[PDB]
Design a protein around this nucleic acid. Structure first.
Ligand SMILES: [Mg+2]
Lengths: 137, 59, 117, 204, 122
RNA sequence: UGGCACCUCGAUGUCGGCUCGUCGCAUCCUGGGGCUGAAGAAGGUCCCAAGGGUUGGGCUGUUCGCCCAUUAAAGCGGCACGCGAGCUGGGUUCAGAACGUCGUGAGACAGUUCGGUCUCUAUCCGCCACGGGCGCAGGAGGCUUGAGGGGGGCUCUUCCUAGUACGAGAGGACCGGAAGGGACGCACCUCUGGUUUCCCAGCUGUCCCUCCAGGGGCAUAAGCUGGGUAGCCAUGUGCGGAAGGGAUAACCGCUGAAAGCAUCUAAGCGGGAAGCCCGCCCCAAGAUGAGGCCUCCCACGGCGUCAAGCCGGUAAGGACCCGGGAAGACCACCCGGUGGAUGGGCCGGGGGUGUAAGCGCCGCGAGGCGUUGAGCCGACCGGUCCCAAUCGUCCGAGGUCU
RNA sequence: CGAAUGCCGGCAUGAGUAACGAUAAAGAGGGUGAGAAUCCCUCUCGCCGUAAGCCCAAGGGUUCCUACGCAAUGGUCGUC
RNA sequence: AGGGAAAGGUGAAAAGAACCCCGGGAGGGGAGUGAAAUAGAGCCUGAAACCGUGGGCUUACAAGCAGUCACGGCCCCA
């Protein structure tokens, strides 16, 4: 009985451990999409990430696109039909956690508010370390 | 002085009947060990006191 | 259904805060203090925590305590003389005990608060 | 009538086939049968189990070792399960298979003295225009001279919650025999750490 | 969530620019409308010539909302505005076009032509 | 709408609206049924049947009506034209003013026009909730039986049977089976989405600590702004009406005389409704008819009109005081009290903020870099006797009989 | 005299009930005393500052200062 | 201008309670005066409403303009 908690942490046997580590910067990625009497076809959603909300398992995040005239927001469980998830630019240099702030004065002014995080770029390049040593090790 | 008001004088009997539950309770007491006295439990009391604690006087 | 939660309160924020700050300044100045039970039982943890910051002793924790207590003089005593006397102790730096007899004034039952040793 | 005792632990959601299902986790630990009710001396047919075993021997008069499995009468006591008569030797979770349907009794959270327009969802009165001292009130409660009184049962304010409540026909999503676990399709009454009993449903 | 008095933008070239819900066409007392639901409207501004005119009483189908919709998969989607597309009593677009994305919920509701004509389905 | 003037002029508030309902059936929908000038589909008309349902706006003070857009339907009435110690006060109806109009005049017109004081404290009955006392013919700790109450009872569209029965075709079924909706009801906080009064940041004025740096108060009862766990919640989730069994209503039959025929009836026997009874959920032995089952504790110890009507110690047990609670106005209820993890601290994890201070480096400077997902950290999941539930006291059988 | 919403006085009921007169705000330690939440002292905290500060006119008529006091007056207490 | 109350009584004699006791006082309890102190000081007599304490009968499956008639039980001088 005692761990009303660790019991629940036990049912969470569906966790993911493979998806890129990102925060209010600039991901982009894929999906699941049903129709046509099939369960198939992956669709891509490229955009700025506005919000990450933590709760152990079932933590979610959301992403912001402008499609044609209109802007769009999508919400993802961080678990299950997300095949890949690779990301565009780990810029962010956000100064805060939620930044819905951008929706209202989003244009080219976005860009001067969200420059590149040289620092976190410099360690995605430097996280290259692929052990090149095949027929060599 | 305003809207709602008693229709009739409340009778002596029904006065006292309200008061059946107004009766009082005697305070609950134990004998002060480490001294001859009564004291209410879970209390420090100044004929006495405690041990690894504060109290009245010692000369 | 209010209260499924906790942290008890009479008065309003700015005032309630300041109460704890003054009561604490008192304990640390006098070693023992006497008030109503509920005022006592709250003062308990607010004070324990200032003690424990003075154990780790770093300039930071100093500046952190200066916010609630405000006398430089007093805070020295806190770090220098009071903190050591514990150090090996893990919490419970403070005691609450209930006296007999109330104020013949408002019927308010009292207690005292000791710095422990 | 299949039936264990148990306790709400909390809830989350999992995935199935390709969609999230909401689930609420019950701990229906092993339930040692301590007494059988016969129609020959009790008049009715039933079985008395027991639950949270743990008890530092504070057991006096109801020591009643009298049935072999007296292994320390449970903290969370013991309830009858009406017409249910198993192989008399403790009831674990194994009784319920995934995909089975269950009714679940429980003790709703307690709201205390509740106002009408919570207790009963009334309309109340306008936040503006006319009056100001009746925004949340019930309005009228009668007619005039006939009948010249208030109906028995009238919905008025009072104590709401903390009540016995059975929600019917929930799906058993899963069962971890390992841990004495039981997963159902969300929304089961009362707070975490509360006693509940779990039975078979009545469905179609 | 769309209801009587809600202004929708129109994403088609029937000429009209903006409409306004008059009633939502689910059951006897349906409270609100969402994507793939059918409303009655009236027109409130138009662009000069085109089949549809200010004042005209029309039918429409909802294709975008500002209140996110929840997928049964456990994800969700939300657009910057509330838009619709103008339908005829035999349920086809009277447009020959549609501008800006649309929600896939349309496809589960049978609004195929709209979906295929669309410039994007999210 | 009136007639009459019987209680009410030491007062029985008066139209319309809102809030909350409850009852009638002379039934607007949905359920049974008989005729039809019923091909089918769709109607007409009458009979049985309230169990539940009976939309949103434009105009006017309106009731009512007309109109827009929908619906299975947008039912008619009673309860002081239900409801002002429950709210409103737009209308008639006090005092101001004007138009038309009548009057020499002062003044007048359910004709118009603009304006105009609606009372903090519930004694009894009644209602919604919650306790105290005694009883239940020994005294206890548990688990139940259900006499008898209450809650709930709605309804559409599309697919398949089949575009097949029917058909002058130009449409379209019964019977039977699936799938989605709309409102309404109980419960819940995973997700979505709110609040989250000091959990974290950012900013302005000013006064202060200590000059720099760093901080504190006040600018609400949060100065302002950007975020935000737990709990409490609906815009969010899950469930619900039902299956089924019995008896019936109009109505459809069997067998059958009075009355050699025929008749549902007079002796008997079958069908037959969203309705009745039971079934589902909830309360319940003050059911003074006070129930039942499991387990426990038993001795007269000393005195009257001899089993308490007796006082004082017991038994099994139960209170008092204490630490607390998704329990709570108080009480009650539940859990703990050293033989202990109940609250407080302290330690780990969750969670929120979003790179503290100090130093080093770069810029004349505002600033910028690194150290650093740093620093601070309510409620949530846990651990640990450091603090605190110490020590004690009081009740409580000794049980008359065929 | 039993009645006059009679007159004068006394005591009841409502009732341990509504209230205790600005939501600027309090805490502790020392005194004193038969007796202190309510008096004196000290240290924290909060409120006013074209005032909730200072100076005159009217009106009031010893309320000014001091020593002894607390039955009453003070919306509680009172050594003030 | 004017309106306009309430409120009398120890004892023949103050002989108006020294002294002791509990209490900050106010009150009381002893003592003492008096023929009498429930004559002790807003004190002769001290009625009624109203408020207490003690004792007998009586009541927790009833229901009423509160009484009356009849039986029956208990409690006090026959
Ligand atoms: Mg008139």
């Amino acid at each position: 009985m005692n761990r009303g908690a660790l019991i629940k942490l036990v049912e969470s046997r569906y966790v993911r451990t493979d998806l890129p580590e990102f925060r209010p910067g600039d991901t982009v990625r894929v999906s699941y999409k049903v129709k046509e009497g099939n369960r198939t076809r992956i669709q891509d959603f490229e955009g700025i990430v506005i919000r990450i909300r933590r709760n152990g398992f079932n933590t979610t995040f959301t992403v912001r696109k402008v499609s044609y005239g209109v802007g769009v927001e999508r919400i993802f469980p961080l678990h299950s039909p997300l095949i890949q998830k690779i990301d565009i630019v780990q810029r962010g240099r956000a100064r805060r956690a939620k930044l819905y702030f951008i929706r209202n004065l989003s244009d080219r002014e976005i860009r001067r508010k969200l420059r590149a995080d040289r620092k976190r770029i410099d360690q995605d390049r430097a996280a290259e370390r692929a052990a090149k040593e095949e027929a060599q090790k | 002085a305003k809207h709602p008001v008693p229709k009739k004088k409340t009778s002596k009997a029904r006065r006292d009947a309200r008061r059946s539950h107004h009766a009082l309770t005697p305070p609950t007491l134990v004998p002060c060990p480490e001294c001859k006295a009564m004291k209410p439990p879970h209390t420090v009391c100044p004929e006495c006191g405690y041990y690894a604690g504060r109290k009245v006087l010692e000369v | 259904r209010h209260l499924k939660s906790g942290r008890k309160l009479n008065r309003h924020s700015s005032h309630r805060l300041a109460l704890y700050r003054n009561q604490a300044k008192s304990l640390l100045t006098h070693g023992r203090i006497t008030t109503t039970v509920p005022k006592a039982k709250e003062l308990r943890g607010f004070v324990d925590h200032l003690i424990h910051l003075a154990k780790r002793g770093d300039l930071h924790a100093r500046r952190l305590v200066l916010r609630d207590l405000q006398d430089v003089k007093l805070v020295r005593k806190l770090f220098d003389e009071i903190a050591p006397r514990y150090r090996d102790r893990q919490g419970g730096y403070t005691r609450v005990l209930k006296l007999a007899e109330r104020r013949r004034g408002d019927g308010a039952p009292l207690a005292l608060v000791e710095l422990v040793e | 009538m299949k039936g264990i005792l148990g306790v709400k632990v909390g809830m989350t959601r999992i995935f199935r086939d390709d969609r999230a299902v909401p689930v609420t986790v019950i701990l229906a630990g092993p339930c040692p049968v301590v007494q059988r009710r016969t129609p020959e001396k009790d008049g009715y047919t039933a079985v008395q189990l027991g639950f949270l075993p743990q008890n530092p021997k504070r057991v006096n008069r109801p020591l009643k070792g009298h049935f072999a499995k007296a292994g320390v009468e449970p903290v969370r006591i013991l309830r009858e399960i009406r017409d249910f008569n198993p192989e008399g030797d403790t009831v674990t979770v194994e009784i319920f298979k995934p995909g089975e349907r269950v009714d679940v009794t429980g003790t709703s959270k307690g709201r205390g003295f509740a106002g009408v327009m919570k207790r009963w969802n009334f309309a109340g009165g306008p936040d503006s225009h006319g009056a100001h001292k009746i925004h949340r009130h019930p309005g009228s409660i009668g007619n005039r001279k006939t009948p010249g009184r208030v109906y028995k049962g009238k919905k008025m304010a009072g104590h709401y919650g903390a009540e016995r409540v059975t929600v019917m026909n929930l799906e058993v999503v899963d069962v971890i025999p390992e841990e004495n676990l039981l997963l159902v399709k969300g929304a089961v009454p009362g707070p975490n750490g509360g006693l509940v009993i779990v039975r078979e449903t009545k469905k179609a | 969530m769309i209801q009587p008095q809600t202004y929708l933008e129109v994403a088609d070239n029937t000429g009209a620019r903006k409409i306004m819900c008059i009633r939502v066409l689910k059951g006897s007392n349906a409270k609100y409308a969402t994507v793939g639901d059918v409303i009655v409207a009236s027109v409130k501004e138009a662009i000069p010539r085109g089949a549809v005119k200010e004042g005209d009483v029309v039918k429409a189908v909802v294709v975008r909302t500002k209140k996110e919709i929840k997928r049964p998969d456990g994800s969700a989607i939300r657009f910057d505005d509330n838009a619709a597309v103008i339908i005829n009593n035999q349920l086809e677009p009277r447009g020959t076009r549609v501008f800006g994305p649309v929600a896939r919920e349309l496809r589960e509701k049978g609004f195929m032509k709209i979906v295929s004509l669309a410039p994007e389905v999210l």
